[PDB]
């Protein structure tokens, strides 16, 4: 089922990353019933990841590179894009869908 | 290929983790290369897992329950007993074989 975007606020609706562009956001993760198991808001500091590289999970590789700068999203990611059948044991259960709350701050 | 115990130093030989009992432990998880990926003993401060809880990943499950308490044993754990081919992106790769240090300290 892979990845879906719905908008939460609109970025500039032109610039949007590139393939070894460096993102910067701020994200909340939930399971499906809605529990946070993560959240760079909550450590009050922005999240870096280099797009292309595979250091986050593949909704993210093609969600987030959906989403313009300044856009915050909903990326509603099935397991086989996220933490698949292993899960993370302890923090994301098996075949979890999941939900990010994502806002792309800049590229750098 | 699953979970590989190999021991470091004795347990009792005699008290092996039952099911729904709390294991308190002290672990260093390494990926195959040797790169420390997190460990109780950097935190001062043991773990502590429920056997059969799938609270941790399956390896865990099936080679902590090899050990007596006291025993301080090497798992290799194969990918499908671990993370899988998603890992956790940013921390274990794809398909990634790991090898835990685990020394069983008591059952609660």
Redesign the interface.
């Known amino acids: 089922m892979g990845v879906q975007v719905e908008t939460i606020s609109p970025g500039d609706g032109r610039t949007f990353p590139k393939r070894g562009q460096t993102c910067v956001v701020h994200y909340t993760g939930m399971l499906e019933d809605g529990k946070k198991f993560d959240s760079s808001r909550d450590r009050n500091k922005p999240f870096k990841?280099m797009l292309g590289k595979?250091?986050?999970?593949?909704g993210w590789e093609e969600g987030v590179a959906q989403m313009s700068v300044g856009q915050r999203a909903k990326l509603t990611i099935s397991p086989?894009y996220?933490?698949?059948?292993?899960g993370?044991?302890?923090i994301i259960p098996?075949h979890a869908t999941l939900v990010f709350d994502v806002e792309l701050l800049k590229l750098e």
């Open positions: 990841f595979q250091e986050v999970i593949r086989d996220a933490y698949g059948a292993t993370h044991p302890g098996p």
